[PDB]
Amino acid sequence: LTEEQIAEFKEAFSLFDKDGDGTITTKELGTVMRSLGQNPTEAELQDMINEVDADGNGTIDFPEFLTMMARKMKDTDSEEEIREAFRVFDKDGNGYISAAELRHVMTNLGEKLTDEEVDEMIREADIDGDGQVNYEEFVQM
């Protein structure tokens, strides 16, 4: 329960709270998850909403989200989360992250980056110079 974790939890919560009301509905949780390549059913979305909503008001506020995310923490530098992060960036599933893919993901996180900025990120990471980023280069990044 460090300050770093709290900041990361807050940034995740703001991304999901698409209208800024301080809560996360079922449709918000759906919409953000699919923007990042996940394919949850409406059945699991309602279930995740009911599990985390403690007071039963039908939505998830930040303390409720915080209670949930504070237990059983995984690690963003773990190869398990690195693997799951590669699934997001490599959207078409060919095993290489392209600039349009990085552009599309950055767009879904709320970043307004020009195409030159994105191309620089690819270059700074592209070791073999093939113009894309594979798993090895993604990890070393």
Partner: peptide
């Protein structure tokens, strides 16, 4: 019923991880 708890965390940690690398990529460049 704690499978749902597990799945929420897993889905969320992927988002947190993605955000962390997007921030870090912006941080390098």
């Amino acid at each position: 019923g704690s499978l749902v708890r597990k799945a929420f965390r897993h889905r969320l940690w992927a988002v947190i991880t993605v955000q962390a690398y997007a921030r870090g990529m912006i941080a390098r460049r």
